[PDB]
Amino acid sequence: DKWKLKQWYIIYAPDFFGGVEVGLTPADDPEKVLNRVVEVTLKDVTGDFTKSHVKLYFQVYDVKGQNAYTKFKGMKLARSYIRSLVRRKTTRIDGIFNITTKDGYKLRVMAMAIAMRRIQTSQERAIRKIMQEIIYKKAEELNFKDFVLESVNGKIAAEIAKEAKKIYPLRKAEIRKIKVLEEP
Amino acid sequence: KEKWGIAHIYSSFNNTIIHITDITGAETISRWSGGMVVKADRDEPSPYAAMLAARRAAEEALEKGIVGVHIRVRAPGGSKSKTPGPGAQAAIRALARAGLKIGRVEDVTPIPHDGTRPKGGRRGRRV
Amino acid sequence: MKRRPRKWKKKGRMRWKWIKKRIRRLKRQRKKERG
Amino acid sequence: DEGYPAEVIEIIGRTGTTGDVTQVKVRILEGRDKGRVIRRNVRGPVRIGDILILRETEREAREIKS
RNA sequence: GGGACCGCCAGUGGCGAAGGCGCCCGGCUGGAACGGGUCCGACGGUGAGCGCGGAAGGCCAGGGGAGCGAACCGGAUUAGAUACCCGGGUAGUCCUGGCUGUAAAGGAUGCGGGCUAGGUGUCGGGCGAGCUUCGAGCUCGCCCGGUGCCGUAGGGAAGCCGUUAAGCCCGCCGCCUGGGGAGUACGGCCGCAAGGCUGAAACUUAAAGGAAUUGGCGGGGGAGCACUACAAGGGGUGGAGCGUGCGGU
């Protein structure tokens, strides 16, 4: 029985998430735990049920005996959440950007906006340019962890909606997905 | 500290497969398909085959310290069927009544934005 | 190959496609007979 | 003969490919799922209050899609 | 690591002469509508011959080939299976240069102008009011252009059409003159070839053909029924010898 050779290892969140206890993982050797993705909802960490749909893939990168510390790899919203947000007679607006942070991290950030009705694609282009400018401005301004927290908390989405309201009222603005392309 | 697992459920129209894995998803803790339990090929995608194999995998997991589970219902996806097979919800009830704490149950179907050309030729399968 | 869509109607007829294919086959053969 | 008794509480309607089956709702009286309401197929005539004996509490009938 | 591809949004939506064209960004470039008391001065419509463009497929030379998949190789079905079904799979599908120049290339409707009830939806623009979280952001109304539906008169064999006419006028071109033989024979021109364009006759035939009504039929759909249909349940034949009738001897 191979299962009896396996031993458990505690995992942990990123420090900017407080390193809360997310769970355990069984493995035969400590080495194999390296470079392992774990998806965890935000309700697990912050305790907020209003942000359950948010999900964070953390890559396990450090092992100290039984205790595993993880890196942040990517963020994604729930597919059901996104699908419910999308509806007919409302325009989906995608803005996908490559970004270099103040501290040198490379981040691929893709964000959605959904308006009240069908809108001219020129307005969609204008809104694209808008939050591109905003996200570049914040990436220049903020370091990695702070930008991560602000992106998750939706303050970026709030600013985006408030500004883009000058172009057209938005039913919702969100940051769909984030990918850690490269670390410095 | 309670233990949580990931229950991949690949329910095709020809078979149903249930695959339990650790929180990382990289470790095969239990893995039973329809062919394990039925003798007729036509019986593989039946709800009975799904649910009883599900209960067998669930008792295996219970023997191995798992108490809660998250479910990853998978469809064929790609250019193939998107709808999960009939055994999906039946197997879901199977684990729910098997004594496990059901957590998040989410679809994980691979849905292409635009993938390869499907089978069946242009006119499709003219059965 | 100036066509007549009337021939497409299968009522009392083959499918025009295969008739065209057959006449093409015969023409190939005949032109090869002339060399 | 570990059978689960249960009591019918509602009759959904005459079902089956020949109408000799009936789709009814039944409340489990003894078993691991006591009190749970379940739709069941019944062969033979049935009235309200018939104590049926189930071999599997898990089984349920597909709804009659009219 | 690879090559194809860009859903949901997506629309009765937009654009384009047509074929056709959907990821974001940067550049180049064509066209159209709107507002214009801004310019020119009839400079226009059509188009034989001519020239350009032109889905898929195929051909020539190179590269590439994930998926799919003519051909082909196996499995199965069937009375038989050169099929429908299944497992593999060449060309092709993709980039480059060129050729071929075809379709239900259909709006089955050649194009330009003048006139002949309206209602109603949406798209782009413009104008007037009101709201506004003050963003033509939102509501409503009027004008212009395109794009749907209902439809008066009217039209048509009817289907249906009906200011986006298949209505009344004006004008240019192209095409048709019963069915088949036949888009064939012969001849010519282009094309590597495949094929493309042009195109008869002899002989045969009294119909072919289009719209719609009534029936019948549908391995179309819908509702109600049926103990000469079935379901639940009983009985009983088909075996035995005999009574009786039938076909045949």
XYZ file of C-alpha atoms (C1' of nucleotides) in Angstrom:
661
model
C 0.000 0.000 0.000
C 1.763 3.098 -1.292
C -0.647 5.357 0.606
C 0.999 4.459 3.918
C 4.307 5.963 2.779
C 2.607 9.304 2.110
C 2.876 12.006 4.768
C 0.928 15.227 5.100
C 2.270 18.759 4.712
C 0.649 22.012 5.819
C 0.178 24.630 3.112
C -0.069 28.373 3.681
C -1.211 31.498 1.876
C 0.897 34.432 0.652
C 2.092 36.826 3.324
C 0.006 39.653 1.849
C -2.975 37.366 2.516
C -1.741 36.799 6.078
C -0.500 33.288 5.354
C -3.760 31.765 6.542
C -4.117 28.004 6.793
C -5.639 26.757 3.539
C -5.130 23.039 4.033
C -2.900 19.995 3.919
C -1.466 17.890 1.110
C -0.146 14.306 1.240
C 3.059 13.439 -0.575
C 5.734 10.760 -0.523
C 8.692 13.172 -0.714
C 9.046 16.884 0.148
C 10.521 17.625 -3.290
C 7.398 16.681 -5.263
C 5.432 19.354 -3.393
C 7.421 22.005 -5.274
C 5.648 23.834 -8.098
C 2.132 22.736 -7.139
C -0.936 24.850 -7.859
C -3.746 25.158 -5.318
C -6.954 27.015 -6.137
C -8.582 28.704 -3.137
C -11.635 30.942 -2.928
C -11.476 34.339 -1.267
C -14.118 33.305 1.272
C -11.561 30.851 2.632
C -9.049 33.633 3.313
C -10.934 36.859 4.013
C -14.026 35.046 5.290
C -16.296 37.134 3.046
C -19.068 35.164 1.355
C -19.720 38.107 -0.987
C -16.381 37.313 -2.686
C -16.679 33.537 -2.944
C -16.533 33.587 -6.751
C -13.008 35.040 -6.672
C -10.348 32.321 -6.826
C -6.577 32.388 -6.393
C -4.150 29.837 -7.794
C -1.061 29.773 -5.571
C 2.024 27.857 -6.713
C 3.750 25.981 -3.906
C 7.406 26.998 -4.016
C 8.924 26.523 -0.533
C 9.004 23.472 1.741
C 10.277 23.489 5.341
C 9.718 19.974 6.657
C 5.958 19.635 7.122
C 5.163 23.300 6.356
C 4.665 24.469 2.768
C 4.822 28.127 1.730
C 3.393 29.231 -1.596
C 3.809 31.832 -4.317
C 0.986 33.690 -6.035
C 0.450 32.447 -9.598
C -2.894 33.717 -10.857
C -6.353 35.023 -10.102
C -9.610 34.050 -11.809
C -13.298 34.662 -11.229
C -15.931 31.934 -11.167
C -17.165 30.843 -14.580
C -20.762 30.818 -13.340
C -20.306 34.349 -12.010
C -18.901 35.605 -15.315
C -21.582 33.832 -17.342
C -24.356 35.290 -15.198
C -22.810 38.734 -15.618
C -22.862 38.313 -19.411
C -26.310 38.776 -20.966
C -27.884 39.606 -24.300
C -28.414 43.251 -25.259
C -25.370 44.176 -23.151
C -21.893 44.727 -24.548
C -18.928 42.774 -23.217
C -15.733 44.852 -23.268
C -12.396 43.085 -22.815
C -9.152 44.829 -21.986
C -6.089 42.559 -21.917
C -2.707 44.069 -21.065
C 0.872 43.114 -20.322
C 2.192 45.128 -17.381
C 5.527 45.588 -15.630
C 5.143 46.490 -11.974
C 7.040 49.052 -9.924
C 9.067 46.184 -8.441
C 9.625 44.475 -11.807
C 7.004 41.723 -11.780
C 5.394 40.882 -15.122
C 1.599 40.631 -14.958
C -0.927 39.774 -17.662
C -4.159 41.465 -16.562
C -7.466 41.014 -18.389
C -10.583 42.900 -17.306
C -14.258 43.066 -18.277
C -16.829 45.816 -18.508
C -20.539 45.307 -19.176
C -22.808 48.264 -19.918
C -26.531 48.951 -19.668
C -27.156 48.358 -23.375
C -25.579 47.874 -26.801
C -23.001 50.613 -27.405
C -20.936 51.789 -30.350
C -17.601 50.021 -30.671
C -15.858 53.396 -30.758
C -17.061 53.926 -27.193
C -15.763 50.446 -26.424
C -12.374 51.463 -27.828
C -12.405 54.623 -25.730
C -13.216 52.664 -22.575
C -10.486 50.168 -23.455
C -7.966 53.005 -23.657
C -9.339 54.396 -20.393
C -8.784 51.466 -18.107
C -5.556 50.661 -19.921
C -4.335 54.088 -18.852
C -5.668 53.584 -15.326
C -4.112 50.152 -14.860
C -0.777 51.298 -16.290
C -0.887 54.286 -13.937
C -1.520 52.067 -10.922
C 1.097 49.516 -11.994
C 3.652 52.311 -12.175
C 2.464 53.701 -8.848
C 2.007 50.489 -6.857
C 4.324 47.590 -6.081
C 3.333 43.953 -6.581
C 1.540 43.044 -3.350
C -0.335 46.321 -2.930
C -1.531 46.250 -6.532
C -2.603 42.635 -6.039
C -4.687 43.539 -3.001
C -6.252 46.572 -4.682
C -7.070 44.555 -7.804
C -8.725 41.822 -5.741
C -10.645 44.265 -3.535
C -12.185 45.901 -6.610
C -11.032 49.447 -5.866
C -9.527 49.421 -9.353
C -12.898 48.268 -10.677
C -14.628 51.023 -8.715
C -12.348 53.709 -10.149
C -12.754 52.233 -13.633
C -16.537 52.334 -13.389
C -16.523 55.855 -11.974
C -14.322 57.163 -14.783
C -15.916 55.220 -17.647
C -19.314 56.510 -16.538
C -18.289 59.613 -18.502
C -18.337 57.460 -21.659
C -21.314 55.255 -20.805
C -22.800 53.941 -17.543
C -21.440 50.482 -16.768
C -23.548 47.673 -15.364
C -20.323 46.278 -13.936
C -16.547 46.505 -14.205
C -14.344 43.642 -13.042
C -10.832 42.239 -13.304
C -11.462 38.805 -14.773
C -8.032 37.198 -14.742
C -4.456 37.917 -13.690
C -1.354 35.876 -14.546
C 2.151 36.098 -13.061
C 4.233 35.965 -16.239
C 7.622 36.521 -14.600
C 9.180 37.534 -11.272
C 12.225 39.843 -10.945
C -8.001 20.181 10.802
C -10.561 18.717 8.425
C -9.390 17.329 5.082
C -10.860 18.387 1.737
C -10.595 16.645 -1.624
C -11.312 17.339 -5.282
C -13.805 15.075 -7.067
C -13.348 15.312 -10.821
C -16.428 13.896 -12.563
C -16.031 13.256 -16.296
C -19.516 12.171 -17.387
C -19.649 11.240 -21.068
C -22.567 9.685 -22.916
C -20.580 6.436 -23.232
C -19.196 6.291 -19.682
C -18.807 8.160 -16.405
C -15.550 8.504 -14.466
C -15.053 9.760 -10.910
C -11.535 10.722 -9.843
C -10.766 11.845 -6.287
C -7.574 13.804 -5.677
C -5.848 15.769 -2.930
C -6.280 19.522 -2.540
C -3.488 20.050 -5.072
C -5.276 17.731 -7.505
C -1.960 16.046 -8.362
C -2.427 12.867 -6.275
C -4.788 10.070 -7.325
C -6.593 9.133 -4.109
C -9.488 7.253 -5.734
C -10.414 6.658 -9.367
C -13.322 4.463 -10.513
C -15.054 4.404 -13.904
C -18.278 2.836 -15.112
C -16.498 -0.186 -16.544
C -15.484 -1.165 -13.017
C -19.046 -1.875 -11.931
C -21.192 -2.914 -14.931
C -20.722 -5.785 -17.367
C -22.578 -4.390 -20.400
C -20.989 -1.572 -22.376
C -24.398 0.061 -22.837
C -24.752 0.083 -19.031
C -21.632 2.193 -18.399
C -23.290 5.657 -18.603
C -26.254 4.500 -16.526
C -26.986 6.437 -13.314
C -26.653 3.247 -11.267
C -23.135 2.650 -12.568
C -22.187 6.238 -11.785
C -23.643 6.319 -8.283
C -22.439 2.942 -7.016
C -18.890 3.521 -8.259
C -19.152 6.960 -6.664
C -20.105 5.405 -3.338
C -17.244 2.908 -3.596
C -14.741 5.704 -4.220
C -16.343 7.692 -1.397
C -15.912 4.871 1.114
C -12.321 4.536 -0.076
C -11.764 8.234 0.615
C -13.489 7.970 3.996
C -11.142 5.112 4.858
C -8.308 7.482 3.883
C -9.122 10.458 6.084
C -11.069 12.661 3.660
C -14.220 14.230 5.109
C -15.092 17.117 2.783
C -14.939 17.211 -1.001
C -15.150 19.716 -3.832
C -16.593 18.469 -7.116
C -15.197 19.293 -10.564
C -17.839 18.178 -13.058
C -16.137 17.837 -16.443
C -17.758 17.406 -19.843
C -16.056 16.171 -23.030
C -15.617 19.771 -24.152
C -13.363 20.747 -27.013
C -15.307 20.105 -30.193
C -17.193 17.276 -28.441
C -20.253 17.370 -26.168
C -20.544 20.144 -23.583
C -23.483 18.737 -21.613
C -22.434 16.529 -18.668
C -23.674 12.980 -18.933
C -26.745 11.676 -17.116
C -24.731 10.300 -14.205
C -23.495 13.706 -13.041
C -26.181 14.656 -10.532
C -26.877 11.032 -9.617
C -23.229 10.614 -8.654
C -23.399 13.963 -6.838
C -26.189 12.606 -4.651
C -24.102 9.449 -4.330
C -21.232 11.291 -2.650
C -23.627 13.494 -0.674
C -25.291 10.407 0.823
C -21.961 8.544 1.069
C -21.146 10.551 4.216
C -18.864 13.197 2.695
C -19.246 16.933 3.256
C -20.014 18.331 -0.194
C -18.288 21.645 -0.832
C -18.176 23.751 -3.981
C -19.492 21.818 -6.989
C -18.331 23.524 -10.180
C -18.285 22.771 -13.873
C -14.769 22.395 -15.282
C -15.727 21.715 -18.881
C -12.977 22.750 -21.336
C -14.891 25.222 -23.513
C -12.934 26.566 -26.514
C -13.430 30.133 -27.604
C -12.953 28.573 -31.018
C -11.303 25.159 -31.245
C -10.608 22.568 -33.897
C -13.151 21.278 -36.388
C -15.463 18.635 -34.853
C -15.912 15.062 -36.034
C -18.809 13.933 -38.208
C -17.804 15.642 -41.416
C -19.690 18.594 -42.782
C -23.100 16.909 -42.880
C -22.494 15.389 -39.450
C -23.152 11.811 -38.434
C -25.976 10.652 -40.712
C -27.175 7.898 -38.397
C -21.385 23.718 -69.770
C -24.314 26.095 -70.129
C -26.704 24.491 -67.664
C -30.483 24.227 -67.473
C -31.827 24.222 -63.881
C -34.947 22.450 -65.151
C -32.886 19.261 -65.312
C -32.212 19.517 -61.575
C -35.777 18.438 -60.814
C -35.446 14.710 -60.150
C -39.043 13.926 -61.196
C -38.569 11.272 -63.858
C -34.802 11.761 -63.943
C -31.505 10.870 -62.328
C -29.588 13.424 -60.287
C -28.066 15.834 -62.794
C -24.702 15.715 -61.005
C -24.012 12.102 -61.937
C -25.274 12.611 -65.481
C -22.745 15.414 -65.833
C -20.038 13.168 -64.410
C -20.922 10.400 -66.860
C -20.901 12.717 -69.863
C -17.517 14.016 -68.717
C -16.204 10.450 -68.520
C -17.480 9.681 -72.009
C -15.978 12.882 -73.402
C -12.596 12.093 -71.849
C -12.695 8.633 -73.397
C -13.761 9.953 -76.808
C -11.133 12.693 -76.939
C -8.537 10.081 -76.025
C -9.794 7.880 -78.874
C -9.068 10.712 -81.309
C -5.624 10.929 -79.682
C -34.699 -8.138 4.403
C -33.448 -4.688 5.433
C -36.307 -2.865 3.742
C -37.274 0.738 4.483
C -40.993 1.358 5.114
C -42.437 4.644 3.911
C -45.874 6.250 3.654
C -47.395 7.763 0.525
C -48.501 11.386 0.867
C -49.239 12.539 -2.704
C -49.966 10.967 -6.092
C -48.221 12.689 -8.990
C -50.210 10.809 -11.614
C -50.623 7.765 -13.813
C -47.274 7.038 -15.482
C -45.543 4.232 -17.340
C -45.531 3.396 -21.018
C -48.918 1.670 -20.552
C -50.334 3.586 -17.567
C -50.088 0.577 -15.245
C -47.481 2.463 -13.186
C -48.173 5.415 -10.912
C -45.798 8.197 -9.894
C -46.384 9.120 -6.255
C -44.668 11.062 -3.482
C -43.690 9.098 -0.389
C -42.252 10.151 2.967
C -39.701 7.802 4.516
C -40.779 6.583 7.955
C -37.870 4.284 8.873
C -34.288 4.436 7.628
C -31.272 6.707 7.417
C -33.382 9.331 5.570
C -36.423 9.441 7.858
C -38.849 12.232 6.995
C -37.425 12.926 3.532
C -39.963 13.204 0.703
C -39.172 11.185 -2.434
C -40.941 10.466 -5.711
C -41.441 6.760 -6.384
C -42.887 4.458 -9.016
C -45.620 2.040 -7.938
C -46.964 -0.990 -9.797
C -50.546 -1.906 -8.995
C -53.295 0.352 -7.684
C -52.497 2.716 -4.832
C -54.395 4.886 -2.352
C -53.249 7.588 0.039
C -51.589 6.039 3.080
C -50.213 2.796 1.635
C -47.056 1.748 3.473
C -44.617 0.947 0.670
C -41.356 -0.942 1.237
C -38.252 0.478 -0.458
C -35.076 -1.470 -1.186
C -33.035 1.702 -1.818
C -33.767 5.137 -0.379
C -31.468 6.742 -2.960
C -33.547 5.796 -6.001
C -35.824 8.443 -7.499
C -38.061 8.551 -10.554
C -37.658 10.881 -13.503
C -40.361 13.534 -13.580
C -43.252 12.951 -15.985
C -42.444 15.441 -18.753
C -45.839 16.088 -20.341
C 6.790 22.412 -28.008
C 3.397 22.542 -32.182
C -0.182 24.279 -36.222
C -5.495 25.766 -36.813
C -8.699 29.242 -34.850
C -10.714 33.913 -32.372
C -17.321 31.554 -29.040
C -20.539 34.167 -25.278
C -21.303 39.263 -26.594
C -23.758 38.361 -31.758
C -28.643 40.998 -33.106
C -34.540 40.465 -37.746
C -26.827 44.113 -36.207
C -22.747 46.736 -39.363
C -19.665 47.123 -43.833
C -18.514 45.829 -48.687
C -20.045 45.975 -56.287
C -20.173 40.710 -55.619
C -17.401 36.648 -53.780
C -17.260 38.111 -48.899
C -15.643 40.282 -44.085
C -15.935 39.201 -36.557
C -9.712 38.763 -30.659
C -6.856 43.839 -28.907
C -3.230 47.277 -30.292
C 0.073 50.514 -33.991
C 0.512 52.295 -39.127
C -1.332 52.742 -44.457
C -5.570 52.919 -47.532
C -10.879 52.486 -50.170
C -16.001 53.715 -49.794
C -20.567 55.564 -47.721
C -24.367 58.687 -44.712
C -25.030 62.885 -42.109
C -24.482 69.107 -41.415
C -22.854 72.600 -45.180
C -26.771 79.412 -48.772
C -18.239 75.478 -49.759
C -16.404 74.928 -55.149
C -17.333 73.168 -60.477
C -20.847 73.689 -64.185
C -24.792 68.766 -67.454
C -19.073 67.158 -66.815
C -24.697 62.339 -67.125
C -27.519 56.771 -67.699
C -26.400 52.079 -70.274
C -22.602 49.250 -72.258
C -21.537 45.261 -77.857
C -16.468 44.186 -78.431
C -12.745 45.084 -74.192
C -10.677 45.146 -69.295
C -10.754 44.065 -64.006
C -12.450 41.275 -59.998
C -14.164 36.651 -58.705
C -16.627 31.058 -52.646
C -15.361 26.011 -52.606
C -12.590 22.611 -55.559
C -8.452 21.387 -58.876
C -3.258 22.290 -61.218
C 2.159 24.015 -61.264
C 6.984 25.119 -57.771
C 8.507 25.632 -52.762
C 7.574 25.062 -47.060
C 4.221 22.944 -43.329
C 1.059 19.751 -41.599
C -2.580 19.982 -34.960
C -7.489 18.660 -36.254
C -10.534 17.095 -40.000
C -10.617 14.200 -44.101
C -11.768 12.502 -51.087
C -8.891 8.175 -52.212
C -7.677 3.914 -49.727
C -7.067 -0.115 -45.215
C -9.686 -2.612 -41.433
C -14.559 -3.574 -38.123
C -19.896 -4.038 -38.240
C -24.766 -4.195 -40.463
C -27.545 -6.330 -44.272
C -30.294 -11.668 -48.508
C -25.991 -9.266 -50.231
C -22.841 -3.279 -48.479
C -18.208 -1.436 -53.438
C -22.875 2.771 -48.154
C -25.430 4.919 -44.148
C -22.322 3.387 -38.464
C -17.226 2.726 -36.286
C -11.398 2.523 -36.070
C -6.905 4.315 -39.129
C -5.602 7.237 -43.226
C -3.064 9.938 -48.781
C -4.175 14.387 -51.453
C -6.336 18.789 -49.582
C -7.352 22.095 -45.921
C -2.437 26.253 -44.120
C 2.105 30.297 -45.899
C 4.616 31.884 -50.541
C 4.390 32.816 -56.382
C 1.062 31.691 -60.431
C -2.659 29.221 -63.100
C -7.778 27.416 -63.642
C -12.732 30.758 -63.655
C -16.683 27.498 -62.158
C -22.131 27.185 -57.942
C -29.002 27.038 -55.762
C -22.223 32.991 -57.467
C -30.336 32.987 -55.113
C -33.329 38.476 -53.487
C -33.845 32.268 -58.026
C -35.651 39.608 -58.947
C -29.680 43.640 -64.602
C -28.994 48.908 -63.680
C -30.263 54.825 -63.313
C -34.345 58.489 -62.615
C -39.951 60.582 -61.577
C -44.620 59.530 -59.054
C -48.527 56.384 -56.088
C -52.135 55.208 -47.827
C -50.047 54.491 -43.489
C -48.439 52.050 -38.951
C -44.323 49.921 -36.551
C -38.915 48.113 -34.948
C -33.843 48.938 -35.251
C -29.062 51.065 -37.152
C -25.766 55.917 -38.455
C -26.240 61.122 -38.609
C -28.541 65.769 -37.670
C -32.368 69.116 -35.083
C -36.099 70.414 -30.875
C -37.781 69.464 -25.878
C -37.490 67.022 -20.858
C -34.590 64.131 -17.267
C -29.645 63.529 -15.575
C -25.666 59.741 -10.701
C -24.241 66.079 -15.610
C -21.501 61.066 -19.615
C -26.445 62.753 -26.599
C -25.677 59.266 -20.223
C -31.440 58.376 -20.426
C -36.963 59.482 -22.356
C -39.882 61.511 -26.280
C -40.737 64.064 -31.014
C -39.083 65.794 -36.391
C -35.501 65.249 -40.981
C -32.095 62.324 -43.980
C -29.845 57.319 -45.649
C -29.743 52.047 -45.162
C -32.016 47.762 -42.977
C -36.910 44.364 -40.986
C -42.289 43.389 -40.153
C -47.859 44.531 -40.486
C -50.445 46.444 -44.678
C -54.550 50.441 -47.691
C -55.208 51.098 -52.803
C -53.199 48.455 -56.810
C -50.750 44.053 -59.163
C -50.468 38.842 -60.267
C -52.253 32.193 -62.533
C -51.913 32.145 -57.555
C -48.076 31.749 -54.202
C -47.379 36.236 -52.789
C -45.842 41.405 -53.929
C -46.940 46.002 -52.292
C -42.347 53.587 -51.601
C -36.427 48.482 -50.481
C -42.871 47.003 -55.973
C -43.106 41.739 -58.856
C -47.748 49.203 -59.400
C -47.657 53.701 -63.630
C -44.005 56.191 -66.688
C -38.419 57.089 -68.998
C -33.811 54.610 -71.050
C -29.685 51.031 -72.190
C -28.009 46.205 -72.334
C -28.405 40.801 -71.970
C -31.238 36.485 -72.346
C -35.947 32.984 -74.051
C -39.494 31.079 -78.135
C -42.932 23.149 -76.454
C -40.208 18.276 -74.452
C -35.848 15.287 -75.668
C -32.100 14.516 -78.728
C -28.259 18.294 -76.061
C -25.537 21.475 -73.857
C -24.181 16.515 -77.176
C -21.584 15.884 -82.661
C -18.296 19.034 -85.696
C -15.402 23.474 -85.785
C -12.864 27.493 -83.417
C -10.231 30.156 -79.208
C -7.994 29.908 -73.957
C -5.860 26.389 -70.585
C 0.018 22.241 -68.318
C -4.398 19.298 -67.823
C -8.820 19.090 -65.802
C -11.760 21.781 -68.175
C -13.655 26.982 -69.853
C -16.447 29.886 -73.839
C -19.182 29.380 -78.535
C -22.826 25.624 -80.499
C -25.887 22.352 -84.355
C -28.588 18.672 -86.928
C -30.909 13.792 -87.958
C -34.514 11.350 -85.249
C -38.249 10.983 -81.426
C -42.367 13.059 -78.567
C -48.575 15.408 -77.111
C -46.923 16.496 -73.403
C -43.394 18.535 -70.260
C -44.073 22.351 -66.830
C -45.845 26.397 -62.636
C -49.510 27.673 -58.767
C -53.146 26.219 -55.645
C -58.167 22.744 -53.660
C -60.147 17.808 -52.016
C -58.772 13.282 -50.941
C -55.574 9.383 -49.645
C -50.753 8.356 -47.546
C -46.206 9.781 -44.120
C -40.944 4.450 -40.483
C -44.639 13.966 -39.532
C -46.743 16.065 -35.225
C -51.194 16.781 -31.782
C -56.059 15.114 -28.887
C -59.530 11.221 -27.927
C -60.779 6.183 -28.194
C -61.049 0.928 -28.676
C -61.194 -5.794 -24.633
C -62.838 -7.774 -33.325
C -55.315 -3.401 -29.872
C -52.649 -4.071 -25.954
C -51.715 -3.513 -20.522
C -53.054 -6.235 -15.272
C -55.606 -11.409 -14.506
C -58.040 -15.999 -15.884
C -59.256 -19.490 -19.578
C -57.799 -22.094 -23.948
C -55.786 -23.616 -28.981
C -51.263 -25.330 -31.711
C -49.315 -32.261 -29.277
C -53.024 -36.827 -28.778
C -57.723 -39.882 -30.981
C -62.608 -38.386 -32.776
C -67.062 -34.824 -34.924
C -67.446 -31.426 -38.857
C -65.974 -28.337 -43.055
C -62.109 -26.604 -46.398
C -57.814 -27.274 -50.308
C -55.917 -31.145 -52.834
C -55.845 -36.843 -54.219
